[PDB]
Amino acid sequence: MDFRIGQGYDVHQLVPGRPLIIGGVTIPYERGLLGHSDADVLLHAITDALFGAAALGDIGRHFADSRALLRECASRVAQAGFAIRNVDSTIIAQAPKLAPHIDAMRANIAADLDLPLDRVNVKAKTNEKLGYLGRGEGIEAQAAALVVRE
Amino acid sequence: MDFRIGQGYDVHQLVPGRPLIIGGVTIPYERGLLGDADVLLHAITDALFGAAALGDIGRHFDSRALLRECASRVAQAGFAIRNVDSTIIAQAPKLAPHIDAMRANIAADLDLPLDRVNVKAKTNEKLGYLGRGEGIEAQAAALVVRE
Amino acid sequence: MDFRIGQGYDVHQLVPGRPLIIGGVTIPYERGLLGDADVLLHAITDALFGAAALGDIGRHFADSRALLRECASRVAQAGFAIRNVDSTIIAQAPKLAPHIDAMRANIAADLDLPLDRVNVKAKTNEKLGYLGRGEGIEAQAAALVVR
Ligand SMILES: Nc1ccn([C@@H]2O[C@H](CNC(=O)c3ccncc3)[C@@H](O)[C@H]2O)c(=O)n1
Ligand SMILES: Nc1ccn([C@@H]2O[C@H](CNC(=O)c3ccncc3)[C@@H](O)[C@H]2O)c(=O)n1
Ligand SMILES: Nc1ccn([C@@H]2O[C@H](CNC(=O)c3ccncc3)[C@@H](O)[C@H]2O)c(=O)n1
Ligand SMILES: [K+]
Ligand SMILES: [Zn+2]
Ligand SMILES: [Zn+2]
Ligand SMILES: [Zn+2]
């Protein structure tokens, strides 16, 4: 009965000489995301949505392999007494084509959250050529999570 | 009971010689959306696929027909739609007097009562491509239950 | 029972000559938001009206905290109890972490929630766009309610 929702936002710059890692998937591409960690923009947004659902603050309060961060986030959410019910998310990127990699992202997140595949979703959008996202200056992710307090 | 949430995002450019169509409503305006490029129905569509964990709009496919088909697929995965909430971000034109008709369009397409469908509008305070009137963005959130 | 979700978005310009007020907290900074222009409370207000399918902040509507209290009252009177709120402030500067618990406390008090049902997060924009250049501040909110 004790359901809670969270939401998460993250953006990183796209620079050359970094490998591209979104949703724990290394995607072949001539640029990658810039950050202190591996800068996995999708995992960061999801981590934030989970801490938010559980009212545990945010990713900078708590915390690098972003999958390990995601698993520790999930561990702390479980320790606060919440079970995760579902995750949805959107990646907004001009390039590259993310469709061939989506199911793999979905699978990594399921694994890290200990959820079946059917409770995790990843969507991909272009920004229709508008703003810094449209110019391919960075990649944004958005996330939503529903949890319930056991 | 087995609740799930989804979230949707869409943006489209504003261009000359296109009708402005948002939430199924034709709004008098010098320019319209490129793509019927209905940004609001697209966001809601993605929010619903996301909640049912069915992927996204481009993995599946006018916008009202597509919103109807999304609803069909959501029910096919065995979910009922509980509510939809959404925001349109447009510097111009004024959307307020069309919002109720958008809600009515959406409620009909999703076979939902009016009180389970919401549409909100914001400017972007003259900031960015939104503030300059170069595009219109929509955001949506959807709650479903596996019945 | 009858759960519903709302989402909210808000943005304001950051200029000198205005004080910075986010989540009801006055934050010392060379610049502030143009509108009391409380970007966080506006977004949360929008998210609550959205969950209750009551339109948006402009249709209903004093400082932003009284507006939030009136919002919650109307949400109650519509048959809904607030279950939780989560949110994100996106600002390149200044550092918001020290002010987070104050913001949560104001929101919780205004909604009559226990603190552990209100969350506020902070993010930079990695120096991208008008947000990353310190030209505005954005807030996003999600609200869960039940009838
Ligand atoms: N204006 C701000 C912004 C952030 N933070 C705190 O600083 C933290 C790290 N920065 C990030 O914004 C970030 C992390 C991961 N990926 C991309 C960006 C943030 O999580 C918040 O706790 C803060 O105190 N004040
Ligand atoms: N980087 C990306 C981006 C998108 N897609 C896939 O390409 C699809 C279409 N593009 C749209 O972004 C879109 C659709 C409708 N309205 C506005 C925008 C998208 O849904 C995703 O499945 C992808 O494979 N890789
Ligand atoms: N294109 C639009 C945009 C908005 N509105 C109506 O104008 C209202 C207020 N303006 C704001 O967008 C706003 C409020 C607070 N902070 C920043 C911005 C809005 O809530 C909606 O009712 C409208 O009718 N048409
Ligand atoms: K945005
Ligand atoms: Zn990040
Ligand atoms: Zn679209
Ligand atoms: Zn505002």
Side-chain angles (χ1 to χ4, degrees), chain A residues 2-29 31-35 37:
Chain A
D2 191 8
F3 283 98
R4 314 288 180 90
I5 66 171
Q7 62 80 234
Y9 168 85
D10 208 47
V11 70
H12 282 280
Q13 295 188 38
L14 259 179
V15 301
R18 300 261 304 196
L20 182 56
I21 312 182
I22 301 157
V25 184
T26 297
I27 301 159
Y29 200 54
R31 291 180 296 150
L33 301 163
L34 177 72
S37 59

Side-chain angles (χ1 to χ4, degrees), chain A residues 2-29 31-35 37-96 98-128 130-150:
Chain A
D2 191 8
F3 283 98
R4 314 288 180 90
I5 66 171
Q7 62 80 234
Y9 168 85
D10 208 47
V11 70
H12 282 280
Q13 295 188 38
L14 259 179
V15 301
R18 300 261 304 196
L20 182 56
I21 312 182
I22 301 157
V25 184
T26 297
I27 301 159
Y29 200 54
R31 291 180 296 150
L33 301 163
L34 177 72
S37 59
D38 62 11
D40 194 318
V41 65
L42 175 62
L43 304 188
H44 291 183
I46 293 161
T47 296
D48 259 10
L50 291 160
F51 283 132
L56 293 175
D58 74 29
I59 194 181
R61 177 190 143 166
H62 286 268
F63 302 125
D65 178 358
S66 293
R67 292 199 58 203
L69 297 195
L70 181 58
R71 286 193 294 280
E72 180 62 29
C73 159
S75 184
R76 294 177 193 182
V77 169
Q79 195 68 45
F82 298 96
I84 304 161
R85 289 299 187 85
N86 92 288
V87 174
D88 186 28
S89 67
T90 299
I91 306 150
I92 308 77
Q94 189 269 335
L98 295 170
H101 308 285
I102 291 296
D103 279 354
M105 300 182 183
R106 229 160 136 254
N108 289 337
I109 297 153
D112 294 343
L113 295 188
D114 190 22
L115 285 169
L117 286 170
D118 59 42
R119 295 165 171 275
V120 176
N121 195 71
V122 182
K123 311 187 291 307
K125 278 309 246 278
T126 72
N127 215 47
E128 296 276 347
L130 295 161
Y132 56 86
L133 290 175
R135 292 187 286 278
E137 259 131 54
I139 296 186
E140 172 187 320
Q142 301 175 4
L146 173 73
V147 305
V148 60
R149 182 139 185 168
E150 321 270 70

Side-chain angles (χ1 to χ4, degrees), chain B residues 89-93 95-139:
Chain B
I89 310 163
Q91 201 55 40
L95 300 170
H98 308 292
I99 273 155
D100 287 327
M102 298 180 192
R103 293 177 62 233
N105 289 344
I106 302 158
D109 293 340
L110 296 184
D111 198 27
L112 275 173
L114 214 40
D115 61 357
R116 296 175 173 276
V117 173
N118 198 66
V119 178
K120 310 185 301 302
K122 300 290 293 235
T123 69
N124 217 53
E125 291 285 337
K126 263 292 170 224
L127 289 160
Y129 52 90
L130 294 175
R132 292 194 305 275
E134 296 168 4
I136 292 175
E137 166 181 336
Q139 310 169 358

Side-chain angles (χ1 to χ4, degrees), chain A residues 5 7 9 13 48 57-58, chain C residues 84 88 121 123 125-126 140:
Chain A
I5 66 171
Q7 62 80 234
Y9 168 85
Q13 295 188 38
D48 259 10
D58 74 29
Chain C
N84 84 291
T88 297
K121 307 191 288 313
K123 269 279 159 72
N125 218 47
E126 287 282 318
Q140 303 170 357

Side-chain angles (χ1 to χ4, degrees), chain B residues 90 93 95-96 121-123 125, chain C residues 10-12 42 56-59:
Chain B
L95 300 170
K122 300 290 293 235
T123 69
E125 291 285 337
Chain C
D10 194 37
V11 61
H12 283 273
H42 292 171
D56 61 43
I57 192 166
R59 298 234 262 143

